[PDB]
Paper text:
Cthe_2751_is a 15.8 kDa singleton from an anaerobic, hyperthermophile Clostridium thermocellum, with an unknown function. Therefore, based on primary sequence analysis, Cthe_2751 is a non-Pfam singleton with an unknown function. Each monomer is made up of 8 α-helices arranged in a spiral pattern around a vertical axis that runs through the centre of the protein. The structure reveals an all α-helical topology similar to those observed for nucleic acid processing proteins.
We have solved the 3-D structure of the non-Pfam singleton Cthe_2751 to 2.17 Å resolution by Se-SAD. The 2.17 Å crystal structure of Cthe_2751 in space group P212121 consists of α-helices and loops with no β-strands. Cthe_2751 crystallized as a dimer in 3 different crystal forms. Superimposition of the dimers crystallized in different space groups revealed no obvious differences in the position of the Cα atoms suggesting an identical mode of dimerization in all the 3 crystal forms. The analysis revealed that dimerization occurs via a large area that spans 904 Å2 (12.8%) of the surface area per monomer. Interestingly, the aromatic ring of Tyr88 from one monomer protrudes into a concave cavity formed by Leu52, Pro53, Leu84 and Tyr88 of another monomer, zipping the monomers together. As for the crystal form P212121, the packing arrangement of the dimers clearly deviates from those found in space groups C2221 and P4122. There is a 60.9° orientation difference between the corresponding dimer in P212121 and that in other two space groups (C2221 and P4122). As expected, the inter-dimer distance between 2 closest dimers in space groups C2221 and P4122 is relatively similar when compared to that of the distance between dimers of space groups P212121 and C2221 or P212121 and P4122, where there is almost no recognizable co-relationship.
Author numbering:
A (entry chain B), B (entry chain A): 2 to 129
The structure:
Amino acid sequence: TSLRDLIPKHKFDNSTIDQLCKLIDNEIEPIIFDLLKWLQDYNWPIAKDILPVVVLHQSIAMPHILTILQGNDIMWKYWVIKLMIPYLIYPNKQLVKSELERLSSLEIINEDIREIVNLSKDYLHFYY
Amino acid sequence: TSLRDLIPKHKFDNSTIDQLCKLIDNEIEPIIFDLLKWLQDYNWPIAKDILPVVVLHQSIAMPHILTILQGNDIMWKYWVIKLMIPYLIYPNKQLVKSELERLSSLEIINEDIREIVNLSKDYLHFYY
C-alpha cells in the first residue's frame, strides 16, 4: 500500500530496489519520473541500482526524459543522456534526436555547457 | 524460422530492428543467443542497435550470458561484461557476480586476459 513508498528517500536508500525490480512497465509508470530524479547525480550510490530499472522501463519513461532534456537541470540531462541514450531501443532513440541536436548547438558559455554540447555531438555521430 | 529470419544476416543488417523492437521476452527468447552473437565485436555497426534489445530482454538472456562468460571467446565475454552488467537490474546482476570473481582470478599471460581481469575487478568494485 503506497507506490510512492518505493521512491528512494535519499542518495543511499536502496531499501526499495528489490521491490522496484519486480514491477512491469504499467505498474511503475506513476513513479517513473520520481525514480529518474535519482539519476540527477550518478555519483550517488542509489543511482547505480536505479539506472538499470529506468532503462528497462524506458518505453513509459520517454515523455519524462524529454521534459528533463528541455529543462534547466544541466547535471541531470548530462547523466540521462550519457547513461540512457546508448541503451534505448531504436524507436526510443529516435524520439530524443531533436533534443540532442538542439543541445549540440547551444552557445558554449561555460564548462558544463561544453560538456553537454560535446557529449551531444559525440552521441549523434556514434548512435545516429 | 520466421523468428530466426529476424536475426541480422551481417554486420550492416539493420533490416529486422523494427520487428525486434516490438517483441516481448517470451517471444524473443528462442533467438536471444543468436542476437547476443552480434556483441562479439561492438565495433560492428549492427551491435549498437542489438545491445539495447538484449539488455531490454535480460531476464530471459541470463542463462545464455552465463554460457558466454563461461566459454572460450575472450572478446565476446569482454563486450558482454563491459556493456551489459552496468544495466542488469539487481537480481540479474547478482547472477553473474561469481563469474566476474572467477575471471578476475585468471593468471594474466597476455594483454587480452589483462583486459578481462582489469574489467572484472573494476566492475566488481564499482557495481557490487
